[PDB]
Amino acid sequence: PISPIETVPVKLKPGMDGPKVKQWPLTEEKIKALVEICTEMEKEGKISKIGPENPYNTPVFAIKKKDSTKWRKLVDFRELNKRTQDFWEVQLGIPHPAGLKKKKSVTVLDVGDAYFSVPLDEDFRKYTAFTIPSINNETPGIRYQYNVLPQGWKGSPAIFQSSMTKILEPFKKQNPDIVIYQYMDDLYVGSDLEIGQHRTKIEELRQHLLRWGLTTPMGYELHPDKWTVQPIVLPEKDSWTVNDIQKLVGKLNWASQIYPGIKVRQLSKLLRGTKALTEVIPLTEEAELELAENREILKEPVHGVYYDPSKDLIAEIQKQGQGQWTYQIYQEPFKNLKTGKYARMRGAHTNDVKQLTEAVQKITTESIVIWGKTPKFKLPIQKETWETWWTEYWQATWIPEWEFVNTPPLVKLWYQ
Amino acid sequence: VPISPIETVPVKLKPGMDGPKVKQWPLTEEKIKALVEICTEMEKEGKISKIGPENPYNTPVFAIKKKDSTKWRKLVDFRELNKRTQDFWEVQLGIPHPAGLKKKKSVTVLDVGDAYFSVPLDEDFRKYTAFTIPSINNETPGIRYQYNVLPQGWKGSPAIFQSSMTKILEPFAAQNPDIVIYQYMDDLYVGSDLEIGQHRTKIEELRQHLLRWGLTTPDKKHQKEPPFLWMGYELHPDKWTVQPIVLPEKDSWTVNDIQKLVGKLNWASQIYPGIKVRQLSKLLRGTKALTEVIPLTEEAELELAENREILKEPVHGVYYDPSKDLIAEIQKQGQGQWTYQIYQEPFKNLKTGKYARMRGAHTNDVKQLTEAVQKITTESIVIWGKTPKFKLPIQKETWETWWTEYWQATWIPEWEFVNTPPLVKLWYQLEKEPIVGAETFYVDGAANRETKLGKAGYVTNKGRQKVVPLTNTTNQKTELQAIYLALQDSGLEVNIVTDSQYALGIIQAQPDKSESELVNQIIEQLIKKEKVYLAWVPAHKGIGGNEQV
Numbered sequence: 023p024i025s026p027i028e029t030v031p032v033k034l035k036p037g038m039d040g041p042k043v044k045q046w047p048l049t050e051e052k053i054k055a056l057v058e059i060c061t062e063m064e065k066e067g068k069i070s071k072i073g074p075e076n077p078y079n080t081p082v083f084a085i086k087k088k089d090s091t092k093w094r095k096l097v098d099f100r101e102l103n104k105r106t107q108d109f110w111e112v113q114l115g116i117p118h119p120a121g122l123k124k125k126k127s128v129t130v131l132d133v134g135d136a137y138f139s140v141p142l143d144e145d146f147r148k149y150t151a152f153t154i155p156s157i158n159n160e161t162p163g164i165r166y167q168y169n170v171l172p173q174g175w176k177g178s179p180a181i182f183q184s185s186m187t188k189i190l191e192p193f194k195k196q197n198p199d200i201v202i203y204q205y206m207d208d209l210y211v212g213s214d215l216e217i218g219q220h221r222t223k224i225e226e227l228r229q230h231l232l233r234w235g236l237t238t239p240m241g242y243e244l245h246p247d248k249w250t251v252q253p254i255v256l257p258e259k260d261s262w263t264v265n266d267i268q269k270l271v272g273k274l275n276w277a278s279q280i281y282p283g284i285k286v287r288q289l290s291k292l293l294r295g296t297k298a299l300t301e302v303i304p305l306t307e308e309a310e311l312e313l314a315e316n317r318e319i320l321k322e323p324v325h326g327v328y329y330d331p332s333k334d335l336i337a338e339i340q341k342q343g344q345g346q347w348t349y350q351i352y353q354e355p356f357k358n359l360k361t362g363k364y365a366r367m368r369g370a371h372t373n374d375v376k377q378l379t380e381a382v383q384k385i386t387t388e389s390i391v392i393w394g395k396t397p398k399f400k401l402p403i404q405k406e407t408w409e410t411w412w413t414e415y416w417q418a419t420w421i422p423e424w425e426f427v428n429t430p431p432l433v434k435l436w437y438q
Numbered sequence: 439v440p441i442s443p444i445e446t447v448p449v450k451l452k453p454g455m456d457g458p459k460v461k462q463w464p465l466t467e468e469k470i471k472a473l474v475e476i477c478t479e480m481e482k483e484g485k486i487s488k489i490g491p492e493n494p495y496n497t498p499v500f501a502i503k504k505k506d507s508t509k510w511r512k513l514v515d516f517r518e519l520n521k522r523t524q525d526f527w528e529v530q531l532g533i534p535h536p537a538g539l540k541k542k543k544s545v546t547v548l549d550v551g552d553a554y555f556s557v558p559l560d561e562d563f564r565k566y567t568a569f570t571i572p573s574i575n576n577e578t579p580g581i582r583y584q585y586n587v588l589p590q591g592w593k594g595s596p597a598i599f600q601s602s603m604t605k606i607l608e609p610f611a612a613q614n615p616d617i618v619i620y621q622y623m624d625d626l627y628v629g630s631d632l633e634i635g636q637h638r639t640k641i642e643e644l645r646q647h648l649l650r651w652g653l654t655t656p657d658k659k660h661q662k663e664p665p666f667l668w669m670g671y672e673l674h675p676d677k678w679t680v681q682p683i684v685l686p687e688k689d690s691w692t693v694n695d696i697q698k699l700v701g702k703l704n705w706a707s708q709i710y711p712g713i714k715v716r717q718l719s720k721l722l723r724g725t726k727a728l729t730e731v732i733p734l735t736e737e738a739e740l741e742l743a744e745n746r747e748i749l750k751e752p753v754h755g756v757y758y759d760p761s762k763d764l765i766a767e768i769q770k771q772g773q774g775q776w777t778y779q780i781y782q783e784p785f786k787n788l789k790t791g792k793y794a795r796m797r798g799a800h801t802n803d804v805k806q807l808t809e810a811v812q813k814i815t816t817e818s819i820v821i822w823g824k825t826p827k828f829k830l831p832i833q834k835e836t837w838e839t840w841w842t843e844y845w846q847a848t849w850i851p852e853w854e855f856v857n858t859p860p861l862v863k864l865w866y867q868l869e870k871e872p873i874v875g876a877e878t879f880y881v882d883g884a885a886n887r888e889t890k891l892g893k894a895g896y897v898t899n900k901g902r903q904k905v906v907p908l909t910n911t912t913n914q915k916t917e918l919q920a921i922y923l924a925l926q927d928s929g930l931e932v933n934i935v936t937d938s939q940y941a942l943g944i945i946q947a948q949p950d951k952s953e954s955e956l957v958n959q960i961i962e963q964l965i966k967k968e969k970v971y972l973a974w975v976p977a978h979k980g981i982g983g984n985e986q987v
């Protein structure tokens with residue numbers, strides 16, 4: 023391999039040093055996998071062993087590709103990204119098309135391998151250093167740094183930008199109705215075509231890229247035109263106890279914060295006096311009128327809620343049980359950009375961590391499609407547990423930022 | 439004479455920083471001669487070079503007499519240089535754990551002398567290492583030197599030496615794959631399963647190899663007969679344990695004393711099953727000072743007593759056998775306290791350990807068990823590179839009914855039920871639905887947030903009403919004590935209804951134990967009951983409610 027022009031100069035944000043993040047301990051299996059992988063990548067001159075004079079480190083994990091038996095190496099570049107990519111966001115930045123979410127179908131392709139063709143700027147290489155950890159600190163880890171553009175670093179899709187635009191240009195002009203957006207190592211291709219026809223166009227693009235030297239190792243198929251903020255549902259029941267009306271009034275009270283108009287004032291008079299919880303209550307005229315106020319005002323979303331590109335995206339997930347989970351993506355409290363639910367199977371395979379991982383990946387993907395950025399998650403899981411088991415189910419080239427929330431009181435009831 | 443033919447590691451100063459300039463003219467006219475001798479003997483070995491005053495840099499040098507007086511040693515203060523030099527890769531933040539080592543037929547321990555002085559230093563950097571022995575006096579210029587090798591105490595010596603040693607070893611490890619070598623600082627720990635004679639041979643080969651590289655090794659045998667007192671361990675050929683731990687006896691204890699105490703206890707807990715640090719550590723919430731005297735409690739005294747009882751009879755650990763299964767067993771101990779043993783064999787323990795929760799007010803047994811399992815998973819991954827088979831004192835019905843309806847996501851590996859009481863169980867379960875015909879208490883309570891006086895009260899459906907006065911209480915403790923009140927005044931089946939999101943928060947999580955006495959009482963009432971249903975209604979929304987101001 024040879025560079026067409028000299029390596030693209032890559033500097034760091036002023037007053038910022040390279041990432042010193044420590045390497046997570048690994049199982050012997052994953053270590054061996056990373057050792058084969060890195061031996062081969064070193065044989066291919068993609069990476070090089072480094073000395074004690076390289077203080078920087080960013081973690082490495084071993085995750086599988088799709089369903090296969092091939093071990094893949096995933097580097098967490100989030101820190102190096104925060105450091106070098108914030109002004110690589112502005113300088114080389116790839117603008118986000120706003121029409122990708124309106125198209126009837128969207129497919130995703132992994133183009134990351136392409137980055138292995140381009141060499142990385144020498145001066146910057148020290149910052150890509152990683153370590154394969156030994157079991158039980160019996161030896162110091164194995165230390166490599168990237169010679170070429172590493173996957174997962176967001177400087178790589180920015181540097182490869184021009185080339186991707188070249189390769190894509192003919193396909194783009196031949197198909198004006200197709201939206202193509204590169205986020206990280208992924209190509210997101212939207213169309214209004216029928217599913218089969220969309221797959222034809224997609225296979226066309228695949229083979230095109232393939233004969234331009236771009237390898238792309240049914241599949242991942244998105245339908246963003248089914249995506250909308252999910253409304254609030256008040257229960258449908260034949261006979262109503264006092265407790266049911268309590269929950270009704272409560273959920274209505276919490277919901278009244280989002281939408282101002284609704285009022286429960288006529289539903290409280292049926293609970294007048296001190297009732298037994300299981301006492302059955304009829305439904306009067308006025309309360310039913312205020313229920314008519316209740317249901318039709320909750321099926322139409324709030325106004326004045328707009329996305330702010332400056333503010334981060336925050337995603338909260340709550341476990342509703344039986345494999346079901348719910349989520350909300352929003353910048354500021356009481357204002358919701360995106361709202362949804364997710365349902366895995368009834369078991370025979372899945373567990374909590376699996377379902378949560380798939381959920382997080384889904385939500386991140388949606389956010390990538392819509393806002394061109396990944397949300398920051400508040401995760402309903404113990405920190406150590408996630409940090410241990412998350413790589414197991416992780417099928418994606420990127421990683422979102424995350425924290426761990428310990429305290430939902432009532433919200434599981436309210437969002438179901 | 440240990441010179442070296444080794445590739446040096448390039449070193450730069452922190453950007454925008456020049457070399458250290460610090461000077462000492464006076465005193466020590468006795469030790470200055472020792473410095474002369476030391477430096478002349480260090481020059482012939484090529485370790486240092488005398489330099490012409492071209493205006494280079496300077497750092498202090500002191501000659502300290504060693505104890506048991508025989509020879510003099512030379513000390514240099516590099517803190518300034520270390521402040522101005524670049525950052526390196528962390529040599530070791532960890533230690534290997536003996537429980538993870540593989541049992542070998544022969545283990546040889548070599549220590550390389552003049553380790554740092556046997557590794558050459560980068561040329562362009564050498565000027566920054568310049569130190570100058572003063573001259574007695576009369577305004578005669580002192581003798582200027584600089585280091586040609588890794589200076590002792592320098593910032594980049596351990597890492598660079600580790601690298602150099604690694605590379606020096608690299609060919610030999612390939613030539614003799616049947617033996618295993620570990621690097622720790624200077625020390626090389628070699629081991630093999632082959633014949634004792636073959637072992638002696640290989641060891642001698644390696645010794646002469648290192649000596650060809652300029653790294654000296656013990657000339658009389660390998661020395662170092664097992665034990666093997668290493669890093670606070672006793673390493674026996676077939677066994678491993680902890681160096682003797684002396685627990686003192688005192689009339690008065692300070693923060694330093696309790697800290698060192700809980701330290702030694704922690705260090706003991708790995709090989710000694712049953713160690714409890716909880717109350718003793720609770721005494722350390724007095725961290726305000728250091729030399730401040732802390733009076734012991736009864737629980738702490740009994741804790742230290744039980745620990746003393748545990749330590750009095752020695753017990754040992756066993757090494758690792760990758761061809762054997764890995765098992766982990768957790769047993770319940772005391773308030774917020776758990777203990778585990780990891781073993782491949784029934785009576786042979788790889789190690790032991792403890793777990794306790796220092797953070798959060800209220801938590802139940804299933805949760806704490808889960809957390810223990812997690813800690814052991816992490817620990818086993820770090821030590822052995824895998825996750826063991828867990829054997830737990832919990833029924834599957836229990837845990838299944840736990841992680842299903844627990845709001846938090848959690849995962850636990852393959853685990854087998856073992857019956858060794860106490861078995862972890864659910865002491866009570868709240869109803870998910872209200873109780874028919876059963877008395878429904880409407881509870882409330884409040885407090886003046888200044889006077890710090892409050893009231894806790896209830897109004898039922900059957901017409902019963904009550905208000906209990908409460909002194910020195912806040913708004914939360916009142917609305918908890920209202921639930922308490924409704925509990926103690928109700929039959930075996932009760933529907934309690936509160937406007938407190940706090941109280942509902944505590945109760946709905948279903949803690950079996952807390953450190954709050956009131957919450958402990960509420961727990962006891964919940965256990966004593968049969969069917970309890972907690973329900974919540976928005977505060978000040980004018981439902982049935984209790985209004986007492």
Ligand SMILES: N#C/C=C/c1cc(Br)cc(Oc2ccc(Cl)cc2OCCn2ccc(=O)[nH]c2=O)c1
Pocket residue numbers: 534539540541542543544545547618619620627628629662664666667668673674675676757
């Ligand atoms: N100073 C001092 C000594 C410290 C020290 C520190 C470490 Br880390 C390891 C070590 O010895 C070993 C070295 C390599 C291997 Cl593969 C196993 C070892 O032990 C296997 C178990 N074993 C350990 C000791 C012994 O005599 N016989 C034996 O079979 C020694």
